């Protein structure tokens, strides 16, 4: 399950990196950014909210 894996990636560790930097609120590990530590969908569905700085979008 995911619940004890929260505890897994929370505790002390034997050495530097058995770690994974997963999303704070969403329990997904994959497709995560270090800048925000937010997963794929969650950054998006919050990005629409007008909460994080900033524009976003369509100039490239």
């Amino acid at each position: 399950a995911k619940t004890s894996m929260v505890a897994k990636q929370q505790k002390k560790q034997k050495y530097a990196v058995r770690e994974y930097t997963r999303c704070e609120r969403c329990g997904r590990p994959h497709s995560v950014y270090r800048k925000f530590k937010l997963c794929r969908i969650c950054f998006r569905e919050l990005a629409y909210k007008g909460q994080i700085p900033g524009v976003r979008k369509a100039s490239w």
């Binding site: 990005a47 629409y48 909210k49 007008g50 909460q51 994080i52 700085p53 900033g54 524009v55 976003r56 979008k57």
Partner: peptide, 12 residues
Amino acid sequence: IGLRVGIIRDWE
């Protein structure tokens, strides 16, 4: 809101 933002709403 993710479209109108950038122009006509600041962030929360």
